Design a protein around this ligand. Structure first.
Ligand code: CL
Length: 218
């Protein structure tokens, strides 16, 4: 998987899956910019942009400035996300609002700021990190799963809106079934790079569930 010379944006890049994906693209030769609310880790070998991706004004400001400097956005990875659990009737107003603001609104903002670039340049790839909680109901995750189901739906319609421009748009849904140990971020990142790569050039509007089979194919 070679991304030499390609410009790659990754949200949620301060930690977790987003960080692992940003690092994997750096190691594959890409020019990576990571976006996150905080960069509290000890090492970021890529450019960082610290903002609330849930905030449409901040995303507009940062993305417009970056798009003035780059000639192509080769890969966009949406990997922001927060997990707030609870019985539906106990979940706080704050946890409900912030779950949707971050888990759906962030990608919505990124799509609003990048779709014109994808149309202009032709081509490119988008990968969005959903969740297997978007595929089956999970006790304690009603809001999380619902936000990830909205994210998936949004990403698929954006993929249809950009299909005429040659853009591929896919998802990954992380977690004797489950088969194996829980997938670590580095392993999710592998699947993201596959879907962003030329080896996936006729794959679009697909969602690979990486959870050891827990959804039994759903
Ligand atoms: Cl958090």
């Amino acid at each position: 998987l070679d991304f030499h010379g390609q410009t790659v944006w990754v949200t949620g890049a301060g930690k977790g899956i987003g960080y692992a994906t940003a690092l994997a693209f750096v190691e594959a030769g890409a020019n990576v910019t990571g976006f996150d609310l905080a960069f509290d880790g000890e090492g970021y070998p890529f450019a960082t942009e610290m903002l609330d991706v849930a905030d449409a004004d901040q995303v507009r400001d940062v993305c417009a400035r970056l798009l003035n400097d780059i000639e192509r956005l080769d890969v966009l990875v949406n990997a922001a996300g927060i997990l707030r659990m609870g019985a539906t009737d106990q979940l706080s107003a704050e946890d409900w609002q912030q779950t949707f603001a971050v888990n759906v609104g962030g990608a919505f903002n990124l799509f609003q700021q990048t779709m014109a670039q994808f149309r202009r340049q032709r081509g490119g790839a988008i990968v969005t990190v959903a969740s297997d909680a978007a595929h089956t109901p999970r006790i304690g995750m009603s809001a999380y799963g619902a936000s990830k189901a909205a994210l998936k739906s949004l990403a698929l319609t954006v993929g249809l809106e950009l299909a005429g421009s040659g853009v591929r748009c896919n998802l990954v849904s992380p977690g004797g079934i489950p088969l194996g140990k829980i997938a670590r971020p580095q392993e999710i990142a592998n699947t993201i790079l596959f879907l962003a790569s030329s080896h996936a050039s006729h794959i679009t509007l697909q969602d690979i569930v990486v959870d050891g089979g827990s959804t039994l194919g759903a």
